[PDB]
Design a protein around this nucleic acid. Sequence first.
RNA 1: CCUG
RNA 2: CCUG
Lengths: 171, 171
Amino acid sequence: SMKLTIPELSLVVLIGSSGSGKSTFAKKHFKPTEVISSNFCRGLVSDDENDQTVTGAAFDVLHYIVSKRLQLGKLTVVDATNVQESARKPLIEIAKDYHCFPVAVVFNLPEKVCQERNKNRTDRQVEEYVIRKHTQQMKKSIKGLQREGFRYVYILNSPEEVEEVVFERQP
Amino acid sequence: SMKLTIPELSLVVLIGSSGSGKSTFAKKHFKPTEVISSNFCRGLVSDDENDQTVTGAAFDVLHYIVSKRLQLGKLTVVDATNVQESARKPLIEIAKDYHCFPVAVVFNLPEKVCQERNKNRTDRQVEEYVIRKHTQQMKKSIKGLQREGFRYVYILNSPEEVEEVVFERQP
RNA sequence: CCUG
RNA sequence: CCUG
Ligand SMILES: Nc1nc2c(ncn2[C@@H]2O[C@H](COP(=O)(O)OP(=O)(O)OP(=O)(O)O)[C@@H](O)[C@H]2O)c(=O)[nH]1
Ligand SMILES: Nc1nc2c(ncn2[C@@H]2O[C@H](COP(=O)(O)OP(=O)(O)OP(=O)(O)O)[C@@H](O)[C@H]2O)c(=O)[nH]1
Ligand SMILES: [Mg+2]
Ligand SMILES: [Mg+2]
Ligand code: NA
Ligand code: NA
Ligand code: NA
Ligand code: NA
Ligand code: NA
């Protein structure tokens, strides 16, 4: 059992490479409206979830949605890679503005697992160098997450640990 | 600040080398009866907090006290090094027996800091090899703490982070 | 210091 | 994929 305790008013930031299973995990554990996805936001602004050139607009939209949810006291899960500190920073700031608890859930999986999953995907794929970079960035990020402002930091170190997760929401 | 959230019913396990500041930290944040110290227990059984030969008796007494407190629903802080998995295991089990949440607070400080603190102590000192070993064991322990059963894992990565700590005890 |  |  991998029990992850979170407050009812949480901003849950998923941290993981492309192919690490973030979207699958979010669908398993949360309501669809609780999950806001950066790729979905690329689709909202451009019709194309794969379009990297609309990244700025997509994240502007994602951040705006997060802010409205937290204003209204609604638990929110950010489904994006979040492997760069510069990506996490504005999310921590929004949580701070609305007195919300930021939670980090890190998919600390071997690069090989993510590359294999990516190779077999039919929906969307990235190049191998992208997953190599994401995995390196994820690993470098782990130590400093608490200091960034994550009040709960949960690291999942294998697919077996990921599969075992159950969230306990505390009111 | 470094806010560490803990439930009202917690077993707080301090993890750190001799010289890492565990006892000083414990008295800043918790009342005296909330803190049970392994060295104090060596004193209870033998008159000598330094005596390594009475370690079995001392931990038998400490575990018994912890069990009585958790049975009565009283928050308890374990002031011992807790750098070996075999030392943490019985503590996790006692917490489980009494439906208490185990919390890890790790003093991830450089060996050098602990060594210099140790040299300037007038109350009690250990040999250099002891602190070198404890620091290695502490660092090797960090990754696996969640999987051992610690429901919250807090790592303090510098004296500055230690100084910023505020416990938020949740009703 | 759960005992080099 | 917060854009080699
Ligand atoms: N066995 C198993 N496979 C998984 C799991 N999660 C994801 N996968 C596989 O990995 C592929 C990618 O999963 P996603 O959930 O889309 O991964 P992601 O982290 O959202 O990837 P990006 O959206 O590109 O960042 C899926 O199509 C699955 O085949 C899992 O929990 N268990
Ligand atoms: N500057 C500074 N010194 C500290 C701090 N905490 C503890 N010290 C000093 O470090 C020395 C050791 O501190 P303790 O609190 O006894 O450390 P410990 O982890 O309990 O050590 P053991 O009981 O041998 O395991 C003492 O002389 C303290 O005054 C701190 O936060 N800042
Ligand atoms: Mg996805
Ligand atoms: Mg002490
Ligand atoms: Na923009
Ligand atoms: Na792509
Ligand atoms: Na890599
Ligand atoms: Na494991
Ligand atoms: Na260990």
